[PDB]
Amino acid sequence: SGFRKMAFPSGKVEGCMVQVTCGTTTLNGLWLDDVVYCPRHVICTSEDMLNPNYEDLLIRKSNHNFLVQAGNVQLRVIGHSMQNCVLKLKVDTANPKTPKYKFVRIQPGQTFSVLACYNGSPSGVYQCAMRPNFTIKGSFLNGSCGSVGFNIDYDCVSFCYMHHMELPTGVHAGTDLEGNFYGPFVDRQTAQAAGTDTTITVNVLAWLYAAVINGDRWFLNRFTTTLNDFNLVAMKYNYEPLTQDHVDILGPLSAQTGIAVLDMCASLKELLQNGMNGRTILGSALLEDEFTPFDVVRQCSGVT
Amino acid sequence: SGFRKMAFPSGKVEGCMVQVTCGTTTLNGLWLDDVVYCPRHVICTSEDMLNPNYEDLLIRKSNHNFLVQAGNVQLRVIGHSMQNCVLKLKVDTANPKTPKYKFVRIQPGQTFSVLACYNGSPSGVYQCAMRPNFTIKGSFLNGSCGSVGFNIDYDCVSFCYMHHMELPTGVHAGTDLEGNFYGPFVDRQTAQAAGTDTTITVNVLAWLYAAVINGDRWFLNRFTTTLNDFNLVAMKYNYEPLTQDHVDILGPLSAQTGIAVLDMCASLKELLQNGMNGRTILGSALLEDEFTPFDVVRQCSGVT
Ligand SMILES: CC(=O)Nc1ccncc1NC(=O)[C@@H](C)c1cccc(Cl)c1
Ligand SMILES: CC(=O)Nc1ccncc1NC(=O)[C@@H](C)c1cccc(Cl)c1
Numbered sequence: 001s002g003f004r005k006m007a008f009p010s011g012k013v014e015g016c017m018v019q020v021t022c023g024t025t026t027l028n029g030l031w032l033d034d035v036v037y038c039p040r041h042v043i044c045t046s047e048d049m050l051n052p053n054y055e056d057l058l059i060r061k062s063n064h065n066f067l068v069q070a071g072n073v074q075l076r077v078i079g080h081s082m083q084n085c086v087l088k089l090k091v092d093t094a095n096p097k098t099p100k101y102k103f104v105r106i107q108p109g110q111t112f113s114v115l116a117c118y119n120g121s122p123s124g125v126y127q128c129a130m131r132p133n134f135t136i137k138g139s140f141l142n143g144s145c146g147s148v149g150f151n152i153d154y155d156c157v158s159f160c161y162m163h164h165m166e167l168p169t170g171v172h173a174g175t176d177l178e179g180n181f182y183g184p185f186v187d188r189q190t191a192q193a194a195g196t197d198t199t200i201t202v203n204v205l206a207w208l209y210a211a212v213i214n215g216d217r218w219f220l221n222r223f224t225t226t227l228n229d230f231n232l233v234a235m236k237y238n239y240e241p242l243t244q245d246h247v248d249i250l251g252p253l254s255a256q257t258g259i260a261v262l263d264m265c266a267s268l269k270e271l272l273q274n275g276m277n278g279r280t281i282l283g284s285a286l287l288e289d290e291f292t293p294f295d296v297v298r299q300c301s302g303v304t
Numbered sequence: 305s306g307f308r309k310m311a312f313p314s315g316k317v318e319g320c321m322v323q324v325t326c327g328t329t330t331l332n333g334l335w336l337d338d339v340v341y342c343p344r345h346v347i348c349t350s351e352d353m354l355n356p357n358y359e360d361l362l363i364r365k366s367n368h369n370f371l372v373q374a375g376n377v378q379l380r381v382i383g384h385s386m387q388n389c390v391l392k393l394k395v396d397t398a399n400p401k402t403p404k405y406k407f408v409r410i411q412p413g414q415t416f417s418v419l420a421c422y423n424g425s426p427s428g429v430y431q432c433a434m435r436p437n438f439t440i441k442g443s444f445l446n447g448s449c450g451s452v453g454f455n456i457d458y459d460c461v462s463f464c465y466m467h468h469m470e471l472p473t474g475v476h477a478g479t480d481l482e483g484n485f486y487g488p489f490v491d492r493q494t495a496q497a498a499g500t501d502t503t504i505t506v507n508v509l510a511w512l513y514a515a516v517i518n519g520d521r522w523f524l525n526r527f528t529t530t531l532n533d534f535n536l537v538a539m540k541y542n543y544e545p546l547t548q549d550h551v552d553i554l555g556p557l558s559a560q561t562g563i564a565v566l567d568m569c570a571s572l573k574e575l576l577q578n579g580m581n582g583r584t585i586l587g588s589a590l591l592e593d594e595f596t597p598f599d600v601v602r603q604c605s606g607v608t
Contacts, residue, residue: 001474004443006428009419011315115313121608124310125429137587139308141606170305170519215474275582276589283441285580285589302445304425 003210003282005290006299007113008152010125015097018075019120020089020146021067028117028146029068029089030159030177032098036068036075036089037177038146039164040082041187049189058082063089069120070095084179085187086162100156103177108132109200109240111292112149112160116140129290130161132240133197134183135171138163149174169194199239199289201268202246206293208264209253211281213300218279220259223266230265237272249293256300307514307586309594310603311417312456314429319401322379323424324393324450325371332421332450333372333393334463334481336402340372340379340393341481342450343468344386345491353493362386367393373424374399388483389491390466404460407481412436413504413544415596416453416464420444433594434465436544437501438487439475442467453478473498503543503593505572506550510597512568513557515585517604522583524563527570534569541576553597560604 020029020038024045029038041049043057061080066089068075079090106112111129115122116139128136128149140147140163149161164174164187171194173185185192212220231241247261254261268287276285291299324333324342328349333342345353347361365384370393372379383394410416415433419426420443432440432453444451444467453465468478468491475498477489489496516524535545551565558565572591580589595603 001445001470002441002443002476004430004441005309006420006430006443007311009315009318009426009429010313011318011426014313014315116310116606118606118608122313122315123606123608124603125313126308126310137306137308139306139310139603141305141604143606166305172306278579280590286584299428299443300445302420302422302427302447304422304427 001214003214005127007125007127010115012099012157013115013148013150014122016095017117017120017122019069022065026119028120030148031070031095032101034091034094036091037086039162040085040087042087052188054082085175085181086179102156102158104158104160105176106130106160108134109203111290111295112151114138114149115147116144117147118143130182131197133195135173135194138172140166140172167192167194201234201240201242202249203289203291204268204287205250205264206253206296207288207291208268209257210296210300212257212259214282216281219267219271219281221267221270224263225266225269230269233269233272252297253293305518307518309431311429311431314419316403316461317419317452317454318426320399321421321424321426323373326369330423332424334452335374335399336405338395338398340395341390343466344389344391346391356492358386389479389485390483406460406462408462408464409480410434410464412438413507415594415599416455418442418453419451420448421451422447434486435501437499439477439498442476444470444476471496471498505538505544505546506553507593507595508572508591509554509568510557510600511592511595512572513561514600514604516561516563520585523571523575523585525571525574528567529570529573534573537573537576556601557597
């Protein structure tokens with residue numbers, strides 16, 4: 001028992017982190033096979049970030065200008081290319097620690113672990129959710145760019161995020177491993193505001209099921225609701241509309257606890273309308289939305 | 305910017321996890337050099353756990369009864385001994401992945417990362433605090449025993465916790481790596497209640513400093529207090545009394561923000577007396593106490 005914001009074990013990803021330096025700029029790269037992936041803004045100075053022409057900037061750069069270091073050993077760069085907002089540096093040595101991996105573009109509301117890194121060295125690991133507005137609420141400082149987000153399926157690492165930018169709001173923006181930003185963000189030092197961030201209803205419901213499984217039952221009531229009635233409440237509280245696909249994914253949790261999804265929706269509706277009244281659920285005084293139904297089942301079943 | 309419950313990268317510890325089986329019981333072991341450390345209750349059946357005589361139980365066990373597996377390879381057991389509540393299994397092979405390590409007995413209020421494991425395989429990593437009542441609020445299921453807690457200082461892993469037991473309360477109890485339980489707990493299936501759990505005042509203060517550093521300043525007020533006046537409030541709200549040692553440790557955070565420790569104590573006093581009024585601090589609707597002043601400085605400076 002007990003429920004925690006749990007991250008995947010980070011070892012397979014630690015073995016891939018390298019330091020990439022170009023001119024005066026140093027950030028992190030991801031070494032998989034004979035390719036190092038890093039944010040393309042490594043070729044920029046803070047002066048260039050105001051309005052960078054990455055094609056023209058990359059033209060003044062050769063293989064020897066990209067310094068890649070894996071711990072204390074230098075990798076020889078034999079090729080460089082730009083794919084969307086990432087640079088791909090071909091090195092002459094395949095990473096001997098390359099795990100079985102995939103590149104995946106996650107959907108908003110899905111979760112992933114982040115291995116924060118500085119100068120190619122891992123500092124920490126935490127669990128994140130891709131917000132419905134395509135930002136992440138991470139913990140990143142200057143030098144953290146190139147830190148990756150991932151999921152693990154037994155022995156396979158699915159890389160889904162590469163950190164690129166911190167908005168003036170203090171929220172984070174980045175790309176998939178093909179260099180496509182999540183959301184409308186561009187890799188430019190300009191005012192970019194994150195749109196309205198809604199609460200991931202299906203995740204809050206999954207977390208309510210985790211609370212019931214782990215003993216916290218005070219919020220359960222004698223009521224039920226319909227998808228349309230619940231969604232009228234969800235709109236008012238900036239919660240994502242619940243669909244039958246969401247109800248379907250909550251099926252295993254509903255079967256485990258014996259509580260119908262719409263009954264759990266009525267508990268959530270009353271929690272939205274009346275608050276927690278000073279009470280807590282799984283040690284939290286607010287409705288947690290960064291656990292997917294898959295995360296709840298995984299943690300409550302012990303998937304390694 | 306951004307503040308998260310961050311765990312240490314787990315790779316060095318993943319390379320040490322093994323599966324230990326004795327009779328019908330399977331749990332996790334920690335392989336360092338030519339020794340495997342695991343909870344001694346591995347020699348018990350659930351029938352034995354009611355009132356186990358570990359000395360008599362261990363007498364009916366030989367080196368060949370302890371099956372140690374590191375992934376898919378079997379380790380040859382050449383010795384076995386009981387040290388307090390842990391068994392030490394001498395194997396004929398030193399772990400090639402043994403990191404630089406230490407065994408440390410942490411103090412209540414200190415934090416550490418847990419690598420939850422099942423059948424010698426890592427499932428996840430999360431940050432914990434040793435509660436003032438010597439329990440931890442973790443996430444552990446049947447099979448998780450032997451999962452360890454640790455801290456990392458550059459390249460050295462300081463192992464501080466080994467998971468042994470879940471109390472009927474749903475909180476967790478375990479030992480240091482010499483087999484000494486934290487708290488009054490015994491490795492027996494008997495009613496053991498965790499004493500009163502207080503809030504780690506110095507950690508809440510450090511987290512208030514992290515909030516100020518990261519932009520959340522609404523709670524700052526025009527007031528100050530004294531250690532004795534603040535402690536009268538701390539007693540009423542089951543908060544650990546603040547000492548000058550605590551004020552001293554908060555020094556770097558006070559210097560960074562320019563806010564005197566006693567001024568931050570007055571903000572905390574008003575937060576205790578009036579609550580958050582529906583507001584949040586670092587995404588939390590309650591006062592967080594599982595970040596030490598060292599964790600705040602580390603996360604806010606990017607120590608790898
Ligand atoms: C100073 C500082 O803490 N930065 C950071 C902190 C946390 N994450 C990233 C960063 N870095 C950035 O956001 C910068 C270099 C930037 C600016 C404009 C566009 C892009 Cl793609 C990147
Ligand atoms: C069933 C189940 O989820 N267990 C567990 C869940 C989470 N942690 C540990 C455990 N295991 C225990 O607490 C058990 C085996 C036990 C009982 C009495 C004394 C000790 Cl030292 C140990």
